[PDB]
């Protein structure tokens, strides 16, 4: 990457919790910026910094503070997270010139909830290729479904024989709501991995779909019967089958 790192990359927490997001850079740019990106809006500036201990407000500064104690870091603090502060946060840096671009981080998904009992990890299942597809096309499509998760803070990957694959994969760009008319509906997400029929027809070939879910941590309160929905990987798998 380009030297800009955001931490954490995902966070879900309860309303009223203090939250700090950290932007770190390597390129020693004088200016740093914090943005939020909400559906139906462009990037909107929260606060920015024009040097060490030099900060000023953007358009959507309310509910946030920042600190710039050193060149390399710009910290964004929510003193008491509100549900409306649920967003995707992007930091950026730059030289402050009129004719040079800003350089952005990859973003941080932050979910702020009144009730943590809305948080659920995914269940994951792999669906084996159709024999009819194999006969008709000489290709074999596996489907992974990740189901029942909330919030939408997941990363889905495929692993073949212990190595991550990207060729022949497509994962839905957006999850679907399992109950579209329900506030904070749990989500589902699908992905496909397509291989040649001969590759599926090897019982030594192992196909695994992995979903990393970003959830609760130690300082979040939990009182439900079900296991605390902590950050975790949930996986499912299939093996090929000789012809």
């Amino acid at each position: 990457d380009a030297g800009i790192t955001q931490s954490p990359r995902h966070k879900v927490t309860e309303t009223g919790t203090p939250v700090t997001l950290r932007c770190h850079q390597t390129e020693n740019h004088r200016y740093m910026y914090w943005y939020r990106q909400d559906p139906g809006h462009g990037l909107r500036l929260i606060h920015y910094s024009y040097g060490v201990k030099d900060t000023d407000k953007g358009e959507v500064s309310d509910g946030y503070s920042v600190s710039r104690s050193k060149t390399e870091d710009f910290l964004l603090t929510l003193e008491s997270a509100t549900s409306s502060q649920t967003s995707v946060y992007f930091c950026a840096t730059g030289t402050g010139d009129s004719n040079q671009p800003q350089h952005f981080g990859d973003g941080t998904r932050l979910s702020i909830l009144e009730d943590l009992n809305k948080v659920f990890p995914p269940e994951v299942a792999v669906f084996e290729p159709s024999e009819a597809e194999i006969s008709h096309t000489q290709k074999a499509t596996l489907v992974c479904l990740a189901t029942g998760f909330f919030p939408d803070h997941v990363e889905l990957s495929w692993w073949v024989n212990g190595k991550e694959v990207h060729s022949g994969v497509c994962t839905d760009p957006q999850p679907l709501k399992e109950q579209p008319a329900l506030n904070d509906s749990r989500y589902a997400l699908s992905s496909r991995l397509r291989v040649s029929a001969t590759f599926w027809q090897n019982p030594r070939n192992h196909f695994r779909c992995q979903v990393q879910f970003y959830g609760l941590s130690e300082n979040d309160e939990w009182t439900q019967d079900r296991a605390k929905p902590v950050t975790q990987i949930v996986s499912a798998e299939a093996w090929g089958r000789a012809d």
Partner: protein, 196 residues
């Protein structure tokens, strides 16, 4: 900066697409275009401050200051051009205001369409329906009920085979559900292969 750009556009690989942006501001100090792939970082494409068309590889950027109009022109469109494109107008500090962004969906050219709908069975609910290998002109609804889920289309690229394909997935928890009726509220090709 009064920035306006379209919400969404669709084009086919190999084509030319023009993404239009209008703005109005006092003290104009330039206009930027950024590309943003779905969560991640926006990245710089171009900066224009003088009138005219500026070419940078496959992409060009145009500005008319009097009309408060810019466009980004993408030629020889590639799958990797699927992204949002952000118009930003410069700029107490040089910080541009960002437009809402235009999402560009690039459709693959499917040389040998072979539309089919496949059942596939858990490994270890119990099944899903896979509608696959259809041409890019095919539109996938969005279900009527309720008890059944239908994804948007997704393009996969079997890189070594130089082969791309569209698909969508449907499933339900309910007992009545069948793959024969799964995509009923979609207009699908009449010769759609339904095995077996």
């Amino acid at each position: 900066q009064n920035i306006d750009q379209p919400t969404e556009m669709t084009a086919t690989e190999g084509a030319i697409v023009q993404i239009n942006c209008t703005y109005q501001t006092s003290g104009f100090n330039g206009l930027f275009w950024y590309q943003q792939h779905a969560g991640e970082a926006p990245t710089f494409l171009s900066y224009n401050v003088l009138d005219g068309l500026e070419e940078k590889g496959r992409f060009s950027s145009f500005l008319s200051r009097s009309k408060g109009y810019s466009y980004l022109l993408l030629k020889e469109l590639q799958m990797k051009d699927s992204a949002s494109y952000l118009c930003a107008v410069q700029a107490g500090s040089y910080i541009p205001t960002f437009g809402r962004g235009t999402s560009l969906i690039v459709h693959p050219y499917i040389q040998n369409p072979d539309p089919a709908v496949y059942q596939l069975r858990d490994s270890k609910d119990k099944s899903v329906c896979l509608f696959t290998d259809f041409d890019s002109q095919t539109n996938v609804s969005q279900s009527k009920d309720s008890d059944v889920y239908i994804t948007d289309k997704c393009v996969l690229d079997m890189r070594s085979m130089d082969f791309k394909s569209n698909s969508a997935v449907a499933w339900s928890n309910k007992s009545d559900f069948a793959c024969a009726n799964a995509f009923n509220n979609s207009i699908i090709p009449e010769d759609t292969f339904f095995p077996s």
